[PDB]
Amino acid sequence: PVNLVLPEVENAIFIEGYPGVGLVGHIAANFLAKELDMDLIGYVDSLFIPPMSLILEGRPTPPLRFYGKNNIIIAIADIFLPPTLVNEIAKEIVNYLKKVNAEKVISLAGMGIGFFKDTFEVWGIGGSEEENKELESLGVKILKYGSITGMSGKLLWEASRAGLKSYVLLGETFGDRPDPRAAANVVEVLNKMLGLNVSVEPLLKEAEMIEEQLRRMHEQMEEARRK
Amino acid sequence: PVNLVLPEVENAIFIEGYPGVGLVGHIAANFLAKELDMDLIGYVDSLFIPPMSLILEGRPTPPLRFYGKNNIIIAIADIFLPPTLVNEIAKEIVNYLKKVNAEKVISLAGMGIGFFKDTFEVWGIGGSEEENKELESLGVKILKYGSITGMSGKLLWEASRAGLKSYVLLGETFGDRPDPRAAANVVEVLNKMLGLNVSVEPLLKEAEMIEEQLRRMHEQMEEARRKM
Amino acid sequence: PVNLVLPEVENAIFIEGYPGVGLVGHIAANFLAKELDMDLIGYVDSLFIPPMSLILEGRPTPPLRFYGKNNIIIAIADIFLPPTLVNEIAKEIVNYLKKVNAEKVISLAGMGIGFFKDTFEVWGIGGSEEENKELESLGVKILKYGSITGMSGKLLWEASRAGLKSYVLLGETFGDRPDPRAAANVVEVLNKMLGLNVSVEPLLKEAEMIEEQLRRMHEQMEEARR
Amino acid sequence: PVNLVLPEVENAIFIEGYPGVGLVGHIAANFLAKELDMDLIGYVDSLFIPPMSLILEGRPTPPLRFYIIIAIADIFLPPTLVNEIAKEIVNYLKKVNAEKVISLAGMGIGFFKDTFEVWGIGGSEEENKELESLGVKILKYGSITGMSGKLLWEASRAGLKSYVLLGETFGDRPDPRAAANVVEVLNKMLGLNVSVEPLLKEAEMIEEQLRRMHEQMEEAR
Amino acid sequence: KPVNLVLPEVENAIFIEGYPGVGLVGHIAANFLAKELDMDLIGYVDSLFIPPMSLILEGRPTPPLRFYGKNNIIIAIADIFLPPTLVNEIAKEIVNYLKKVNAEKVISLAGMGIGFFKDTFEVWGIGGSEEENKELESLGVKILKYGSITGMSGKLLWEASRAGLKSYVLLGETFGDRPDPRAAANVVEVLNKMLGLNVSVEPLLKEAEMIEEQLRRMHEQMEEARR
């Protein structure tokens, strides 16, 4: 039902940013793939993904794709998929990551707070206490109580169950709109965590434009959620 | 379609408190798992459970989980599942309980009265006459006529059909709101039945707050029931 | 997908009264099972039956059940099931009845008239001409034209195909309410047919109460029908 | 998923009149089965056919039945099930080396005329020529949906001689008069002498008794 | 099993797909070309999930999903707008067939909804790799840089290219809201240049009003099915 077309990357750092609240993970992951100059290395293939190519820089691309450079893989989705299919995809991802002895599984997500703050924060959660301690060492606050739905929640749990080091970074956000500023906050933490130096200035500079170009996608996603 | 990830506990006392009327069983079972300081020992795993983790005390947790201490297992669910899936889960639970020669299978449920009483009572029903007699020996009234829908009804029947000793404790409740006071009534009876030392005072103390925090969940659950 | 948990009963007379028009067959079959002091002897088991126990006299019981005494089996359902599941259950029932060489397969059903009559009648139909002649010998009128939907219709056909003696008794009824009086008419005929000694007076005496306690179920059933 | 309970009839002429526009084929096929005094010889059996017996002359009958073979259905079935049934029918007809496969259908015109016509189409040019050799006009362009369309194509593809006869009709109502037009052509084609007068005589009454079935069918479409 | 292609081998096929889509641009173009090049019906798609029907064309029963053929060219036509999973299954069988016969080119004809009137509606192109993009640029076709292509055309572009075939989509700009035989005519002109054919589009332009009227229900049908 789902096939991963994805070469083995030994000791992969796997970063997942599927669509979710504020599109925080989606914006962050797309920004990182582009800024780190990643190649398209694979995709998810299923009869249950609706028929489509996205054209990006004059190249056809499938809607669920993996970008790669060196030991880093970033997973992106341009459609918000139904729950059973998310579970099937998570299961294949975890089998892959087990197989290659992934070093880290990091989900990028949003946390809808329902009101404005002058400084939106980033929370973290780890798949075991060891990963919580790593996050605390980086000055990330640990989420104590709450819920993480969707691919990010499923991966956190399943990857940890498979004995992998798993994390979620959650950018606080309004809850009602695409939020490239929250995405920028998440990227800055990911930078610290992986020792990368990706500047988020281009993201903050285009925040208004990105908010506009993704407003329909966000609308699409919210409609699909409430089924 | 459903797998139980759950180590064998020989001679288990298995207590089930899935969401249902008043969230009586849900409140009771969550309270007990916390008050008896239980560990998370397993979960239900299925592609048909929607993708999520719950974070509890800085640990990721799945929505359908089993807590354990000594010979006791408590089963909890944070989502109200469709009927076929509840049947599949009940089947795997019963296979597990057969396998380990469970001593008791006890469901905690609510019974919607449809009006207020000054004193809501607790009823009992057993999977055979022997269990009914045990309940009567504790001073629990036996339900003579009615229906028990959902997990609690199914387990009562399926566990008994597997030759296990099965019971349901039913806290009378309004029928249309979260009822931690009915939950407390059920916990008091369970305490007596199993010789535990759990006070319900902390539950009664947080009744108002619990009723508030669960009011959306209750709403969710009633909506899902009307479809199904 | 469906399993019958049902011991073999040799030369069974199998009476089916699943929910249908007027709940005529349902009331009749429940009444008979109680009046003949039957034991619960089996049930239908399926993941597609929604999760529940019914409590009856302080015993948990499943919603699709078989009662038994001597050579008689009565099949009862408390839920109105979707069509494909009815067919799957009918198929397992007929396999069972083939297996045990059932003597008779008798469905109890209602026939909606669409208006009030001072005297509602009972019609009959047999799986073959032989069973029609038996019914005529008892003074039951043979339905010539019409349709019988649901379990009763399926069983009549499938059981007769399997070489079994098959019948439906149809109590005329309004069509849109529970009708214990029609049920009582059907029970009287069934009594004659099987040489039983069941009085319908307790049914007629509780008619009003039964109509009231089943009014929800009837509503449920009509909703599900579309 | 579908089983045909149907004995072999070597060199069968198979006539299909499942429910469709105007119930033209349905009325025609039922009329012929009755007027030629046919026996019930088989049925379609499937868990996906809803549970029922029809009582006809004091005998229980299934809703999809076979009575020359005439195939009748008293329910309007979903598309996938129609395909599954067509496939079993064609396997059967291949197996017995059927001589002819003839569907009776309606064609919705969308308005009244004083004289509604009958069109024909054949599975190959040979069958078109047979139809022309009597004064049946060949449909040149259009759509035949449902069992009749599927059988025309699948039976042809299996090397069988296939035809559809289409009675023009309003499109909106049961039409025993269109059915009568179709029966007259089928008479000529098979050398039968069935009078359609009893059909025309009861046209009103038939239109009334089938008005709910027609309503049912349009909803399901 | 679920979809079977009944289609003889045509070695080094040029395969042209024009399934229903926006403006019915591909559909009008492909039907026009099949007729103008005098093609025979050479095969069809067979599936229990295609609803039961025959179309009658020139007194011949025909199935709703068909292939026309002459010499090395195959044109694929559909008269019904199919659900997504079934489109994927059909694309998979098409690609297997094209692999098997070592197809020379796979060309999808599609529309691109602009949402307003232009005095001159253009044609865009996209290729399955950079080599095909360069071919299209050599013909003076503008390369689509960013966007999406849904339906059979999008799926084929990607899956054919993945199988190592040369794949293209030609996209005729159109209003987005109506059958557009003019856009179809624009696409046919480009296809002419690409394949070295001389098919005049004058008959198409001459009947544009009539075609728009005859297909207006089909276009309505299709838009309904799309959500």
CATH T-level assignment (fold) for domain D1-221: Rossmann fold (3.40.50)
C-alpha–C-alpha distance, residues E127 and D110, integer Å: 47
Residue B188 Cα distances to B44, B120, B200, C111, angstroms: 28, 13, 7, 53
- Measuring CA to CA, which residue among E24, E17, E4, E7 is closest to residue E213? E24
SS3 state of residue B65? strand
First-to-last alpha carbon distance for chain B, in angstroms, is 20
Tell me whether residue A140 is exposed, middle or buried, using C-beta atoms within 10 angstroms of its C-beta: 0 to 12, 13 to 18, 19 or more. buried
Residue E184 is classified by DSSP as: H
Is B144 near chain C, with CB under 8 Å? yes
Closest residue by Cα to residue C147 from D55, B139, A108, B160: D55
Beta strands D118-122; D137-138: pairing state? parallel
Q: Which residue of A has its CA nearest to B42?
A: A161
- Measured CA to CA, the distance from residue C25 to residue A45 in angstroms comes to 53
- Those chains having 3 or more beta-carbon pairs within 8 angstroms of chain E are A, D
Q: Hey, what CATH topology would domain A1-227 get?
A: Rossmann fold (3.40.50)
E111 backbone dihedrals φ, ψ, rounded to 5° = -110, 160
User: What are the distances in angstroms from CA D159 to CA C43, D9, D100?
Assistant: 51, 18, 11
Contact C179, C24 (CB under 8 A): yes
User: Looking at beta carbons, which residues of chain D come within 8 Å of C160?
Assistant: 60
Resolution at which this structure was determined, Å: 2.2
- Decide yes or no: CATH 3.40.50.10900 for domain C1-226: yes
Q: How many other C-beta atoms can be found within 10 angstroms of the C-beta atom of residue C205?
A: 11
Q: How far is CA A147 from each of CA A111, A113, B18, B51, rounded to the nearest angstrom? A: 9, 13, 19, 11
Say if strands B122-126 and B141-142 run parallel, antiparallel, or are unpaired: parallel
Total CB pairs under 8 A between chain B and C: 59
Burial of D106 (0-12, 13-18, 19+ CB in 10 A): buried
Q: How far is A6 from chain E (nearest CA, A)?
A: 13
CA distance C132 to D41: 21
CA dist C158 and B121 (Å) reads: 50
CB–CB of E166/E195 below 8 Å?
no
CA distance B199 to chain C (A): 30
- Token output for C72: 């008689």
Nearest by CB to E53, which of D87, D125, D143? D143
Closest CA to B203 of B195, B191, B216, B193: B191
Task: Give the sign of the dihedral formed by CA D211, CA D216, CA D217, CA D218.
Answer: positive
| CB–CB contact A51 E150 (8 Å) | yes
**DSSP H or E segment with residue B204:** helix B201-205
Q: Do chains B and E touch (3 or more CB pairs under 8 A)?
A: no
Residues of E in contact with A41 (CB under 8 A): none
In order of C142, C147, C168, D58, E21, the CA distances from C112 in angstroms are: 16, 11, 15, 18, 51
> How far is CA D73 from each of CA C86, D49, D82, D157, E161, rounded to the nearest angstrom?
20, 11, 11, 24, 48
* Full DSSP string of E57-123: ETTEEE-SEEEEEETTEEEEEESS---HHHHHHHHHHHHHHHHHTT-SEEEEEEEEE-SS--SS--E
What residues pair up with C169 in beta bridges, in sequence order?
C108, C124
C129 contacts in chain D (CB < 8 Å)? 58
Report the distance separating Cα C136 and Cα A150, nearest Å: 67
* CATH number for the segment(s) B1-228: 3.40.50.10900
**By CA distance, what is E136's nearest residue in A?**
A58
Contacts of A159 (CB under 8 A, 6+ apart): A94, A97, A102, A105, A127, A165, A166
**With 0-12 CB in 10 A as exposed, 13-18 as middle and 19+ as buried, what is C76?**
buried
For residue E202, what are the contacts with CB-CB under 8 A and spacing of at least 6?
none
Strands (E), B85-175: 104-112, 122-126, 141-142, 146-149, 166-173
The CB-side HSE value for B94 (13 A sphere, CA atoms) comes to 23
> Which residues lie closer than 8 Å to A8 by C-beta, 6 or more apart?
A99, A100
Query: Would you say E144 and E171 are in contact if contact means Cβ atoms under 8 Å apart?
Result: yes
Q: Name residue, tokens 């009675």.
A: D167
Q: Which of residues 33-92 of E touch D (CB under 8 A)?
A: 48-59, 61-63
Three-state DSSP class for residue C39: strand
What's phi and psi for C208, nearest 5 deg? Answer: -60, -50
Tokens 């039913």 map to which residue? B170
Of D83, D142, D150, the CB nearest to E56: D142
Asked whether A177 and A22 are in contact (CB, 8 A), the reply is yes
* Cα dihedral A35/A36/A40/A45 (nearest 10): -80
Interface A:B, Cβ pairs < 8 A: 57
Q: Which of B134, B125, B132, B139 is nearest to B189 (CA)?
A: B139
Q: How far is CA A46 from the centre of its chain?
A: 20
The Cα–Cα gap between D9 and D95 comes to: 10
Q: Count CB-CB contacts under 10 A for residue B47.
A: 17
Cα C4 to Cα C7: distance, rounded to the nearest angstrom? 9
Closest by Cα among D122, D103, D85 to D3: D85
- Nearest CA-CA partner of A183 in A74, A31, A18: A31
The pair of three-digit structure tokens given for residue E137, joined into one six-digit string:
């640029």
- DSSP state, C226? -
Q: Backbone phi, then psi, for D80, in 5-degree steps? A: -65, -35
* Cβ–Cβ below 8 Å for E51 and D123: no
Report the alpha-carbon distance of residue B147 to residue C153 in Å, rounded. 29
The Cα B63–Cα B78 span in angstroms is 5
Count of CB atoms within 10 A of residue B148's CB?
Answer: 27
Contact by Cβ (8 Å): B26, B76: yes
C-alpha pair distances (Å), D103 with each of A186, D15, D120: 67, 6, 10
**Are the C-beta atoms of residues B183 and B111 closer than 8 Å to each other?**
no
